[PDB]
Amino acid sequence: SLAYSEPHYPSPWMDPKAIGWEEAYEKAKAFVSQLTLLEKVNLTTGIGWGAEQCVGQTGAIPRLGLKSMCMQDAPLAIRGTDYNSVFPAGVTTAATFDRGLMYKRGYALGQEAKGKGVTVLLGPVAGPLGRAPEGGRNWEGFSTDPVLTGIAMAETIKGTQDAGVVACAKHFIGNEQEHFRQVGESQDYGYNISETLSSNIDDKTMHEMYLWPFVDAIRAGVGSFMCAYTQANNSYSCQNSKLLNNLLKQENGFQGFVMSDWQAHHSGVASAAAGLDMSMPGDTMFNSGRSYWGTNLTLAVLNGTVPQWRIDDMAMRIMAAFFKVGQTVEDQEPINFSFWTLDTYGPLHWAARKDYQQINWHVNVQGDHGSLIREIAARGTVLLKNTGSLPLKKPKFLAVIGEDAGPNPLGPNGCADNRCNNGTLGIGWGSGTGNFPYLVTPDQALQARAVQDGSRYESVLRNHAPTEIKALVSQQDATAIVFVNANSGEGFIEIDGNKGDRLNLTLWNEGDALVKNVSSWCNNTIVVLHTPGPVLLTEWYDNPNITAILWAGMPGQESGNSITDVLYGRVNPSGRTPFTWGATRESYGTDVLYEPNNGNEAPQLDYTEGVFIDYRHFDKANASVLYEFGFGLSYTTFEYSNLKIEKHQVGEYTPTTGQTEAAPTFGNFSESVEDYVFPAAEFPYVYQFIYPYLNSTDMSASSGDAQYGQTAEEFLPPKANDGSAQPLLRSSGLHHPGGNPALYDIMYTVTADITNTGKVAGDEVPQLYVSLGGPEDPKVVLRGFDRLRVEPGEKVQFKAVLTRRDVSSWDTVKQDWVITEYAKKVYVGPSSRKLDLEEVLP
Ligand SMILES: *[C@@H]1O[C@H](CO)[C@@H](O[C@@H]2O[C@H](CO)[C@@H](O[C@@H]3O[C@H](CO[C@H]4O[C@H](CO[C@H]5O[C@H](CO)[C@@H](O)[C@H](O)[C@@H]5O[C@H]5O[C@H](CO)[C@@H](O)[C@H](O)[C@@H]5O)[C@@H](O)[C@H](O[C@H]5O[C@H](CO)[C@@H](O)[C@H](O)[C@@H]5O)[C@@H]4O)[C@@H](O)[C@H](O[C@H]4O[C@H](CO)[C@@H](O)[C@H](O)[C@@H]4O[C@H]4O[C@H](CO)[C@@H](O)[C@H](O)[C@@H]4O)[C@@H]3O)[C@H](O)[C@H]2NC(C)=O)[C@H](O)[C@H]1NC(C)=O
Ligand SMILES: *[C@@H]1O[C@H](CO)[C@@H](O[C@@H]2O[C@H](CO)[C@@H](O[C@@H]3O[C@H](CO[C@H]4O[C@H](CO)[C@@H](O)[C@H](O[C@H]5O[C@H](CO)[C@@H](O)[C@H](O)[C@@H]5O)[C@@H]4O)[C@@H](O)[C@H](O[C@H]4O[C@H](CO)[C@@H](O)[C@H](O)[C@@H]4O[C@H]4O[C@H](CO)[C@@H](O)[C@H](O)[C@@H]4O[C@H]4O[C@H](CO)[C@@H](O)[C@H](O)[C@@H]4O)[C@@H]3O)[C@H](O)[C@H]2NC(C)=O)[C@H](O)[C@H]1NC(C)=O
Ligand SMILES: *[C@@H]1O[C@H](CO)[C@@H](O[C@@H]2O[C@H](CO)[C@@H](O[C@@H]3O[C@H](CO[C@H]4O[C@H](CO[C@H]5O[C@H](CO)[C@@H](O)[C@H](O)[C@@H]5O[C@H]5O[C@H](CO)[C@@H](O)[C@H](O)[C@@H]5O)[C@@H](O)[C@H](O[C@H]5O[C@H](CO)[C@@H](O)[C@H](O)[C@@H]5O)[C@@H]4O)[C@@H](O)[C@H](O[C@H]4O[C@H](CO)[C@@H](O)[C@H](O)[C@@H]4O)[C@@H]3O)[C@H](O)[C@H]2NC(C)=O)[C@H](O)[C@H]1NC(C)=O
Ligand SMILES: *[C@@H]1O[C@H](CO)[C@@H](O[C@@H]2O[C@H](CO)[C@@H](O[C@@H]3O[C@H](CO[C@H]4O[C@H](CO)[C@@H](O)[C@H](O[C@H]5O[C@H](CO)[C@@H](O)[C@H](O)[C@@H]5O)[C@@H]4O)[C@@H](O)[C@H](O[C@H]4O[C@H](CO)[C@@H](O)[C@H](O)[C@@H]4O)[C@@H]3O)[C@H](O)[C@H]2NC(C)=O)[C@H](O)[C@H]1NC(C)=O
Ligand SMILES: *[C@@H]1O[C@H](CO)[C@@H](O[C@@H]2O[C@H](CO)[C@@H](O[C@@H]3O[C@H](CO)[C@@H](O)[C@H](O[C@H]4O[C@H](CO)[C@@H](O)[C@H](O)[C@@H]4O)[C@@H]3O)[C@H](O)[C@H]2NC(C)=O)[C@H](O)[C@H]1NC(C)=O
Ligand SMILES: *[C@@H]1O[C@H](CO)[C@@H](O[C@@H]2O[C@H](CO)[C@@H](O[C@@H]3O[C@H](CO)[C@@H](O)[C@H](O)[C@@H]3O)[C@H](O)[C@H]2NC(C)=O)[C@H](O)[C@H]1NC(C)=O
Ligand SMILES: *[C@@H]1O[C@H](CO)[C@@H](O[C@@H]2O[C@H](CO)[C@@H](O)[C@H](O)[C@H]2NC(C)=O)[C@H](O)[C@H]1NC(C)=O
Ligand SMILES: *[C@@H]1O[C@H](CO)[C@@H](O)[C@H](O)[C@H]1NC(C)=O
Ligand SMILES: *[C@@H]1O[C@H](CO)[C@@H](O)[C@H](O)[C@H]1NC(C)=O
Ligand SMILES: *[C@@H]1O[C@H](CO)[C@@H](O)[C@H](O)[C@H]1NC(C)=O
Ligand SMILES: *[C@@H]1O[C@H](CO)[C@@H](O)[C@H](O)[C@H]1NC(C)=O
Ligand SMILES: *[C@@H]1O[C@H](CO)[C@@H](O)[C@H](O)[C@H]1NC(C)=O
């Protein structure tokens, strides 16, 4: 009954004919073939926590002029530096339903990363997907929906990598919550567990939901993946061969490299054989001075436990990702910041406190990304309710209410890793953040607008001030705009009992009681919500005194300007909620696991709900919805008509057959153990730094590993060291990453007309849903969408395609995608429940 993860070996090696990777492969081959074993180990092993400048860094190869590779957070900003931008969070980006904006954000991020000397930007995020709305880090990702998220991953990645930086799809996989993600962190919170939470996911659910968006990332050409902290069926993701070897590298033919999350790598030989390619930040645990790779990897190659073909492939994947995005060994942008301090001068080697020099150049990489940020946040703002009060036009009297309207009195970067819920909520907390160059609060932008218009403007920037608030908002003609929030983030930070994950789905800082009080005192109350995910609006949303409600998510640096643009109709809102607003906590049907459920061993997160999370659950159970997935209003109206479906002629879905090549080796290495000894007369051994060298020619003593001495055959599973040609999986694509290319054959083109039946120009977000028709299938699933500009009175065409994959189901008996015999239907409309146009697939 304890969930089990099958062995899948050997770890697949790169394919020289993989489309998109052919040129990268050859550049990697020419480079890797020149390398000594120590130099290959330098590539694969991080230099340690705090070792130099970036969040993580590899060893350098200074013989060939390769500077150390810089791995830097975050998905929405370059973390821990200055003169960068802070972009809107993934969840706000997802809410745009706008491919172009997703690409532009990705590109701008990559430009900032490139300008700092970053090699790999640690984003975007398809895990967590959003199994449960209390998930602390859901806001870093995109949507609960696998299609929207998959598209957002692909667009973001294409942008970042077009800007010349490697992207990293994380976290792979099943890190849906922060509770019990790490042993030490759990123990310091009073949870005595010996291993991290295990996500136990059935094969169908894996293929149709959690894996799906990462496959889109693979097909978009993502250079790297990050394996998760958590386990999958009680094997840690970074040594999980089912995950890394089979699903990622075999079935979906991934050609890039897998890096560990920071302290997610727990074993040397076992992880490498299971598909891990880079150990970040390089040490066993932060500041340990030791590594599961480094010296140990050198020794494992020297003693035979790790084959040469395997380490050669790790270096090939790392270098091929580097070359794929256009980085060169000659013209590397120097690392021009230090993560560990904003000081211009300090130790290059931070943990060791050595090599004092200039470590921050304070390079301005912001360009004109401010206005792009302002635009994305406005387009990802969801108008949930409007009885006529919006847009605002020369109002007599604005009363802006709430702490979330105002500044953090200690400044927008006053708290490390954004760990306060003081002032306006620009982004959440944790590693998925960066330092603001500024943070425009609603109060600043709304005042300036009011003064320009001759509107009266007063604000009370506290949630608990009923005397003052009542006296203000109860006056004649007041338009009360109440800003309220909820917050969440990464598990290393805790605010008021919220350990990463949210304890509840209410507003913070007495937000709910504030909104009830203001709406009881003022019949023109407008509520703006800054939240990482849904909160329960049930007790107050239906008050007619609340004339409008907006969810503005995590807008990033231009918050105040974005919301003012929407409030006054400079942007006509089109953004759609990328999750469901349920009536209760229980209506969601999933929740965070807050208490260990397996004694002192690994807690078990059984995904018994299957694919029925968010709107799939709400539709199937008919649970209480306030606002459905894909819902959002505009200041105009739209009419749907004229649905048409054109059937395409396609060939049969043919199983992929044949063999891989035998695993190649690139270059050779000396057999003299003395050649691998630490070169002490060349440079000093730096404290806590992670090196490839042995301390002496005694291999056993050099390991410092009390269990040293066993061979692959007695501690790894069968075929872990098998470098012979391997049969291809029928679901794989021959030379085609992302699965059998026949999956992406277009089977239908769907079209419909959209007419703007109101007075003003606006964007519409038509959506395409499919009913796959089986009794265990969701009622409808998202399969396409667009964002289209329509003038008053104008008619525009929505056009979208359905691939074979889009109408298939994973058949676990077959281990492939099948189109089931059940009648499928197509729906098109402005939301998951406004299914205006319907037609059966012909
Ligand atoms: C879901 O999860 C959420 C996240 O975890 C969770 O959110 C949390 O909710 C809790 C509970 O609501 C929040 O904590 C509460 O915060 C309240 C507000 O605190 C601030 O304001 C107070 C009152 O301010 C007025 O009075 C002051 C002096 O008298 C003046 O200085 C002010 O200017 C202000 O005056 C105005 O209002 C007056 C009337 O109120 C009016 O006459 C006057 O004219 C004017 O209009 C301040 O006192 C308070 O200051 C404290 O804290 C600050 C730190 O910020 C310190 O600097 C101060 O020294 C001081 O200690 C804040 O600025 C609090 O009122 C509330 O306190 C009460 O409850 C706590 C419970 O722990 C008691 O310890 C405390 O003694 C109080 O008890 C009394 O009332 C309660 C409630 O009715 C009652 O049960 C109890 O028996 C007793 O009667 C509390 O601290 C918390 O902030 C939220 N967290 C986050 C992170 O946002 C949410 O609840 C969850 N939801 C669910 C459903 O599970
Ligand atoms: C976490 O744990 C999860 C739970 O265990 C786990 O999910 C499981 O994932 C594995 C794959 O990793 C699945 O294994 C398959 O099992 C198939 C049999 O499944 C039936 O029996 C099971 C046992 O009783 C049932 O549990 C299962 O029920 C599930 O599905 C039902 C609906 O179908 C549903 O009602 C249930 O509720 C439940 O959800 C089901 O009834 C088995 O067929 C399959 O074998 C193929 O694939 C293997 C590779 O894994 C091959 O080794 C094997 O040889 C088979 O492939 C060959 O044959 C196929 C057709 O028969 C061909 O299509 C293939 O191409 C292939 O053909 C080769 O051989 C031919 C000759 O024989 C030759 O001609 C060809 O050329 C070629 O060489 C596989 O073992 C398992 O079912 C999943 N279970 C569930 C519940 O989801 C999850 O993966 C774990 N996650 C992690 C991260 O570890
Ligand atoms: C050459 O040099 C190298 C480098 O110095 C030397 O390398 C060292 O070699 C020693 C052995 O001499 C290694 O110690 C051994 O490690 C193994 C693996 O430990 C890790 O994985 C455990 C889980 O194992 C399963 O899954 C992995 C894949 O993830 C797979 O490799 C295994 O075969 C096993 O597979 C089974 O389960 C799979 C998943 O479900 C299935 O798919 C599969 O079918 C199988 O059913 C895990 O438990 C372990 O976790 C512990 O340790 C980590 C720290 O590493 C800690 O974080 C955890 O909390 C746990 O405490 C690891 O992650 C391990 O299995 C061995 O343990 C057995 O044997 C010892 C006796 O030595 C017993 O005490 C144990 O109880 C158990 O029976 C053993 O610990 C060492 O890791 C390795 N060092 C490095 C840096 O790589 C090598 O020795 C040299 N060789 C020569 C000839 O010189
Ligand atoms: C695997 O990856 C690792 C990690 O990247 C590699 O390890 C590094 O290798 C490089 C090059 O082989 C080492 O750099 C050399 O460092 C020595 C020693 O410098 C230290 O000690 C000096 C003597 O006391 C001292 O003067 C130095 O201080 C100056 O420099 C620092 C650093 O920039 C600066 O902050 C200070 O203010 C000082 O200005 C320092 O404390 C150094 O002597 C070497 O200089 C060579 O080149 C210069 C010209 O560039 C030349 O003038 C010299 O004569 C000399 O030839 C060089 O900088 C580095 O120290 C290693 N890093 C660590 C952490 O140990 C490893 O090499 C990779 N292996 C493989 C196989 O690829
Ligand atoms: C090659 O790999 C092997 C493992 O395969 C590796 O051996 C391991 O090294 C670690 C780190 O040095 C050892 O763990 C340490 O043990 C000492 C006690 O003797 C502890 O002080 C350390 O505790 C840390 O974590 C604690 C939290 O629980 C903290 O309280 C404390 O402050 C420390 O931060 C730590 O547990 C481990 O015992 C060995 N394992 C084996 C099997 O020998 C070896 O170091 C690698 N070699 C190289 C050269 O990198
Ligand atoms: C919607 O907002 C309006 C204000 O725009 C609210 O109307 C106000 O309701 C209060 C409470 O009933 C009235 O206040 C006073 O109540 C005392 C009771 O002791 C009474 O004696 C006073 O004469 C006075 O009525 C207030 O007059 C009234 N204001 C207006 C302008 O009508 C309304 O209650 C809100 N509704 C909801 C459902 O939130
Ligand atoms: C809030 O309530 C006031 C009355 O308390 C409304 O004021 C009326 O507005 C209409 C126009 O819609 C005028 O013709 C009336 O003369 C106004 N009456 C008074 C007594 O001022 C106000 O419209 C309400 N606001 C909203 C947003 O519905
Ligand atoms: C944690 O549980 C283990 C048993 O797994 C026990 O031996 C240990 O004492 C516990 N930890 C603490 C700090 O009490
Ligand atoms: C706001 O700042 C104060 C420090 O002045 C801090 O104690 C408090 O926790 C912060 N509030 C929140 C909600 O993070
Ligand atoms: C709401 O109003 C009531 C009574 O008018 C007051 O006692 C309570 O403290 C107020 N709450 C907030 C958050 O303003
Ligand atoms: C679903 O619930 C709604 C009320 O929320 C109800 O009107 C409708 O009939 C229900 N549909 C079912 C059970 O199919
Ligand atoms: C290797 O030498 C360093 C001193 O430079 C020491 O701190 C470290 O523990 C040694 N490692 C082993 C495995 O003995």
Numbering used by the authors: 16 to 857
Give the authors' words.
The final NcCel3A structure is composed of two noncrystallographic symmetry (NCS)-related molecules with 842 and 843 amino-acid residues, respectively, 875 water molecules and 85 carbohydrate residues. There are 15 NXT/S N-glycosylation sites in NcCel3A and all are found on or near the surface of the protein molecule. The majority of the long N-glycan chains are positioned on domain 1 and domain 2, and are also asymmetrically distributed onto the same face of the protein. Domain 1 of NcCel3A contains the catalytic nucleophile Asp276, as well as the majority of residues comprising substrate-binding subsite −1, with the catalytic centre being located between subsites −1 and +1. Loop IV is a 23-residue loop in which the catalytic acid/base Glu505 is located. The loss of overall protein stability owing to the lack of central secondary elements may be mitigated by the introduction of a disulfide bridge between the two strands (Cys69 and Cys85 in NcCel3A). The extended loop V, which was first observed in the structures of AaBGLI and ReCel3A, encompasses domain 1 and interacts with loop II on the opposite side of the molecule from domain 3. Loop V folds over three large N-glycan chains (bound to Asn61, Asn311 and Asn318). No distinct density corresponding to a bound glucose was observed in subsite −1 of NcCel3A, in contrast to several other GH family 3 structures. Thus, similar to ReCel3A the existence of a +2 subsite is less pronounced in NcCel3A than in HjCel3A and the enzyme may also have a substrate specificity similar to that of ReCel3A.
In this study, we present the crystallization and structure determination of a GH3 β-glucosidase from N. crassa (NcCel3A) solved to 2.25 Å resolution. The overall structure of NcCel3A is composed of three separate domains connected by two linkers and has a high degree of N-glycosylation. The two NcCel3A protein chains form a dimer similar to those observed in ReCel3A and AaBGL1. The structural analysis further showed that NcCel3A should have a similar substrate specificity to the previously structurally and biochemically characterized ReCel3A.
